[PDB]
């Protein structure tokens, strides 16, 4: 932890980013605080005023859970300020924000187009690979998310996408039959939330079910129910999407096993930073 510790004086704050549980989070810029490097640009995660002491607790918790991972598909810790306050915990800057703001911003109609197409099946099945990669990590830590969903992934300035954060410490559009029904969360309901991810993907982050009601919906998916496939999406995705939404959890495939069926069709890049290809899975 104390080789965490970085002090304030190394932070500057640039703007707002956007809103976290615990407060607002912003873009800023570190002094020093990656070997090799004079500067990094970073995300600050702040806590609110209006939190209780308990609260302030868990902030500080949490970062320390983030400091046992070390995966290139889940948003690093890169420091923590936990002496005075404001408390402040630094992560690594994903230039592009969460994937769901990033795919809406690819439509057509965005007002805010980037200028380029919108997502490759190519860059699609890169998408898929590095979130499942991010995922099998964190079940290997034993972390059950909870709510994998497109707003809970993030795009790094390179375009790679990362998961968040370890999970959440609701999302019923995004949850699987069985935790609907019992209320059971598993690595296996989180492999559900994961085909809604690719669904996001190819419907440029449209809303699930998107007429019906959290009420419907509920009862729909209980029954048997799920989302149909987006217009022309491409049929490898669609396939994924079906193994992932099977009733049964016990026949949705793994992290692992999504990775496998994906790694001849990636990036060069990716056995040299994915777990999968790590000695952390061999
Ligand atoms: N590392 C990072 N790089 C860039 N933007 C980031 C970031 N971390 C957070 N943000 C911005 O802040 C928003 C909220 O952060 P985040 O989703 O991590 O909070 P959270 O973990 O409290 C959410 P919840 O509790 O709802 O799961 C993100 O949607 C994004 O816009
Ligand atoms: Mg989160």
């Known amino acids: 932890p104390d080789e965490w510790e970085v002090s304030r004086e190394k932070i500057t704050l640039l703007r707002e980013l956007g809103q976290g549980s615990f407060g607002m989070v912003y873009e800023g810029n570190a002094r020093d605080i990656i070997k090799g490097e004079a500067e990094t640009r970073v995300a600050v995660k702040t806590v609110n005023e209006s939190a209780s002491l308990r609260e302030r607790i868990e902030f500080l918790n949490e970062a320390s859970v983030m400091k046992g991972f070390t995966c290139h598909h889940v948003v690093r810790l890169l420091g923590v300020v936990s002496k005075g306050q404001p408390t402040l915990v630094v992560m690594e800057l994903m230039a592009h924000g969460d994937l769901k703001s990033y795919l809406r911003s690819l439509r057509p109609e965005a007002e805010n187009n980037p200028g380029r197409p919108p997502p490759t099946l190519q860059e699609m099945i890169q998408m898929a690979a590095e979130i499942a990669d991010g995922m099998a990590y964190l079940n290997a830590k034993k972390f059950v998310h909870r709510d994998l969903a497109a707003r809970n992934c993030m795009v790094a300035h390179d375009f790679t996408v990362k998961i968040g954060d370890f999970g959440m410490t609701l999302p019923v559009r995004w949850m699987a039959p069985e935790s609907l029904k019992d209320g059971v969360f598993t690595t296996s309901s989180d492999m559900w939330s ?3 991810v690719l669904w996001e993907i190819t419907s440029l982050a449209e809303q699930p079910y998107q007429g019906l009601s959290n009420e419907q919906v509920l009862k729909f998916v209980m029954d048997g129910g799920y989302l149909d496939q ?53």
Do not use: Y
Request: aromatic share 12%; charged share 25%.
């Open 194 to 196: 994961f085909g809604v």
């Open 230 to 282: 987006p217009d022309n999406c491409p049929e490898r995705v669609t396939d994924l999407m079906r193994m992932c939404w099977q009733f049964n959890p016990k026949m949705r495939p793994t992290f692992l096993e999504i990775v496998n069926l994906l790694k001849d069709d990636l990036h060069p890049s990716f056995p040299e930073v994915s777990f999968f290809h790590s000695e952390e899975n061999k």
